[PDB]
């Protein structure tokens, strides 16, 4: 089980030849928080879906790791911007378990806000405005046509903005053909810069890997499969593969041509996660006794929205995951 890449493949398979874009950490963090109030088989599926084994120590480490990450981000980044946060919007009628609220505040630094879900329009405005603010206007209207039977919405957001360590020169950007397929061509602004880059020719998966650094410790990795090998590369993606690429990188001089682009992803994860074995939490048989003792509580949907902008100066990326609970 490989969470990030099994999820990637599920999304890719659900929408062939389409752009794909999401934040693995936003979703994993959301699932980890969800597990705090899950029980029995419902919790089991979530932990196994995240790639954990049956050891209690692994569960403790899961939360400890995320708590450490959130605390680390409370310190100013060096050279760029990276924000990650959580919030619970709960209706006054809802009675959350003391332990769940405490765990959310302590482990996930979650914000807690009262919400009148009977006022669907008002609830959407409150939550969407919050998400937009936290993502500096990049994630707008996360929630659309809200159920109205909603009682709690758990939100995770992530915002990233960084300048390339070395920018592309605007005078080096020219219109070029982009081959979606050998027969489908689209015109795109193609940026370019000759420089030394971390590079690797992966003969196993058949792709070229290039690392492009951001100011700070973050980096972008661009993967170009050989002709006709995108499916092969997608099938081979894994945590191990990524580790291999990052450690085997070698410095090489390249005249790099990369398109200036902006793409996004909008998903109803409740329809996708069952592919990773996470299904009970979305049913009437969900065991969410840890979040509320109220009967018939389940997750109606888990919406994810992610966007990215890549240009000559750098990259801006953001995402949010809204987990909606109903009675």
């Amino acid at each position: 089980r490989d969470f990030t890449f099994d999820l990637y493949r599920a999304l890719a398979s659900a929408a062939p030849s389409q752009n794909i874009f999401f934040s693995p950490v936003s979703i994993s963090m959301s699932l980890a928080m969800l597990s705090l109030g899950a029980g029995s088989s419902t919790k089991m599926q979530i932990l196994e879906g995240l790639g954990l084994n049956l050891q209690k120590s692994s569960e403790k480490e899961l939360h400890r790791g995320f708590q450490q990450l959130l605390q680390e981000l409370n310190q100013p980044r060096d050279g760029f911007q990276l924000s990650l946060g959580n919030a619970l919007f709960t209706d006054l009628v809802v009675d959350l378990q003391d332990t769940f609220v405490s765990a959310m505040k302590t482990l996930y630094l979650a914000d807690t806000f009262p919400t009148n879900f009977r006022d669907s329009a008002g609830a959407m405005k409150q939550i969407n405005d919050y998400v937009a603010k936290q993502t500096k206007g990049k994630i707008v209207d996360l929630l659309k046509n809200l159920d109205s039977n909603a009682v709690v919405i758990m939100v995770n957001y992530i915002f990233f903005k960084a300048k390339w360590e070395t920018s592309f020169n605007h005078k080096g950007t020219q219109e070029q053909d982009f081959y979606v397929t050998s027969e489908t061509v689209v015109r795109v602004p193609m940026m370019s810069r000759e420089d030394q880059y971390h590079y690797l020719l992966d003969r196993n998966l058949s792709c070229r890997v290039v690392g492009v650094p951001y100011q700070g410790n973050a980096t972008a990795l661009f993967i170009l499969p050989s002709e006709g090998k995108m499916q092969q590369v997608e099938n081979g993606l894994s945590e191990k593969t990524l580790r291999k690429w990052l450690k085997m990188f070698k410095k090489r001089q390249l005249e790099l041509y990369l398109p200036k682009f902006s793409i996004e992803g909008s998903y109803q994860l409740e329809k996708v996660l069952p592919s990773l074995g996470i299904s009970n939490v979305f049913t009437s048989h969900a065991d969410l006794s840890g979040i509320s003792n109220h009967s018939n509580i389940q997750v109606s949907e888990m919406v994810h929205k992610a966007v990215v902008e890549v240009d000559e100066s750098g990259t801006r990326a953001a995402a949010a995951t809204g987990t909606i609970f109903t009675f």
Binding site: T4, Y8, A12, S17, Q18, N19, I20, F21, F22, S23, P24, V25, L69, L82, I158, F160, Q176, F178, Y179, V180, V186, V188, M190, E194, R208, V210, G216, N217, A218, T219, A220, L221, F222, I223, L224, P225, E227, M230, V233, E234, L237, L242, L246, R252, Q253, L254, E255, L256, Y257, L258, P259, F261, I263, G265, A306, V308, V310, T315, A317, A319
Partner: peptide, 28 residues
């Protein structure tokens, strides 16, 4: 210098001791 052009579908990772974002640019 070796000329490398991303003019076919490609993948993008944004990493920092964690996979912050992951995607496929199929149709820019």
């Amino acid at each position: 210098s070796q000329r490398l052009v991303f003019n076919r579908p490609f993948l993008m990772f944004i990493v920092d001791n964690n996979i912050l974002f992951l995607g496929k640019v199929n149709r820019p």
